Each structure stands twice: as C-alpha cells, then as structure tokens.
Amino acid sequence: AAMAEQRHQEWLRFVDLLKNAYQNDLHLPLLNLMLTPDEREALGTRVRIVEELLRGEMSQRELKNELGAGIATITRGSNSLKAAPVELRQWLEEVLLK
C-alpha cells in the first residue's frame, strides 16, 4: 500500500523519459546512462530467449546450450511469455520471426 503507488509513478516517469528520448534520438546514450553493461547484455539475451520460445524448435536444454542461459532463466522467460497479453505475443511473433 501507498509505496506501491509511489513506485508506479516512478516507473511511469522512466517510461515517459525513455519515450521522449526515442523521439529526440537520445535513447542510446540514455540507456547507456541508465543501465549497466551486464543489464544490457541480459536484455539482448532475453530477446533471443523470447524468439526461440516463440519459434518452438529448441528444447530448454538446447536453448541453454545455445545461449548460455540456465534452465531457471529459460523457465522465467517461458513463464513471463505465457503471462503476456495476446496482442503482444502476436506482435512479437511478427517482429522476431519475420
């Protein structure tokens, strides 16, 4: 309670700042300021996890061998993808597989 609203406004403030950074072509330096190298790497790898989960060809073990992501990391990704709204999942199939 209470703090949850505080955190939500703080998160939306970031979302809006980055929204406007993309509009002004400052998104790349903004994301270098706001994220660590390891965090950027994780996000690049999470995209590939989403891609290969949507593609449906690799087992969890095969996805681990390809990406270096452990079984628990892949399971986190699968559970998050199952939780995503349908419209996002359908769009991701289009953007990441074609």
Ligand X SMILES: Cc1ccc2[nH]cc(CCN)c2c1
Structure-token match 């995503």, residue found: 84
Q: What is the dihedral of CA 61, 75, 96, 45, to 10 degrees?
A: -80
Q: Annotate each residue in 19-58 with x if it binds ligand X (CB under 6 A) or - if it does not, as one string.
A: --------------xxxx---------x--xx--------
The partner in contact with residue 72, picked from ligand X, its own copies, none with C-beta cut-offs of 5 to 8 angstroms by kind, is none
Binding of residue 95 to ligand X (CB under 6 A):
no
Q: Are 21 and 33 in contact (CB under 8 A)?
A: no
- H or E element, residue 39: helix 37-55
Q: List interacting residues with its own copies (CB under 8 A).
A: 7, 9-11, 13-15, 17-22, 24, 26-36, 39-41, 43-48, 50, 76, 80-81, 83-85, 87-88, 91, 95-96
For residues 45 and 38, what is the distance between their CA atoms, to the nearest angstrom?
10
Structure tokens at 78: 């699968």
Contact positions vs ligand X (CB under 6 A): 33-36, 46, 49-50, 73, 76-77, 80
